[PDB]
């Protein structure tokens with residue numbers, strides 16, 4: 001439709017699609033082989049992920065999709081986020097090219113390598129948490145947010161780099177109380193979800209509030225109850241979870257303070 005952005009346009013001729021990766025609600029994501037995404041070398045053929053409208057399309061699907069593409073242009077590169085590589089708006093159907101995370105999302109990454117009984121050593125788990133904290137701090141600094149913030153929304157590269165998916169200016173067990181009841185989202189509500197994700201990591205991909213149907217959960221939070229410390233999880237990291245789950249948002253740590261705490265934990269080597 002419109003227009004041509006020379007900072008981002010990529011010719012479809014050097015883009016052969018491949019097997020689907022997953023969906024959706026905004027668009028199908030396929031694996032794809034791209035030729036010459038790094039123009040220092042017109043030969044090196046690296047893989048990417050490509051986002052497209054599925055086809056009984058919209059009228060609320062192309063709208064946010066192009067809105068999604070414009071948002072990623074403005075934030076720019078960061079190591080701990082799914083970066084935008086190029087776009088194809090010149091010959092018909094819209095393609096959005098992004099970095100490929102070979103190992104799927106964080107929750108699948110953890111559960112697939114789970115032990116059978118009583119790889120994912122302690123520093124790797126801290127490494128995952130530190131990286132996601134680094135990504136969320138950057139997003140907040142660009143006055144952008146990510147309300148969802150579950151392990152299923154963090155992708156893992158071939159090199160165990162954590163990259164947050166989705167960017168912009170019913171998953172009820174991850175949501176801070178004010179976003180759950182008052183329906184208001186802040187940077188401090190993001191920190192609540194990070195605590196839940198912290199717990200997702202050190203249970204190696206467990207389900208939050210296990211055995212609890214999602215309803216009465218609000219009463220237990222009102223009663224001051226939080227999830228217990230997972231086994232073999234050190235009390236320092238459970239202390240951070242409890243700080244992320246403090247009822248008052250101003251009593252919660254900011255993403256800066258969570259990066260320093262996790263950094264001090266990684267430095268223990």
Ligand SMILES: C[C@@H](Oc1ccc2[nH]nc(/C=C/c3cnn(CCO)c3)c2c1)c1c(Cl)cncc1Cl
Pocket residue numbers: 021022023024029049082098099100101102103104105108152153154155165
């Ligand atoms: C809907 C999908 O969006 C994206 C967006 C950018 C991406 N860059 N790279 C991948 C690789 C996906 C993959 C590679 N292996 N596997 C099997 C793993 O079980 C899945 C990928 C997926 C998604 C998925 Cl597929 C998963 N979680 C979150 C999201 Cl948003």
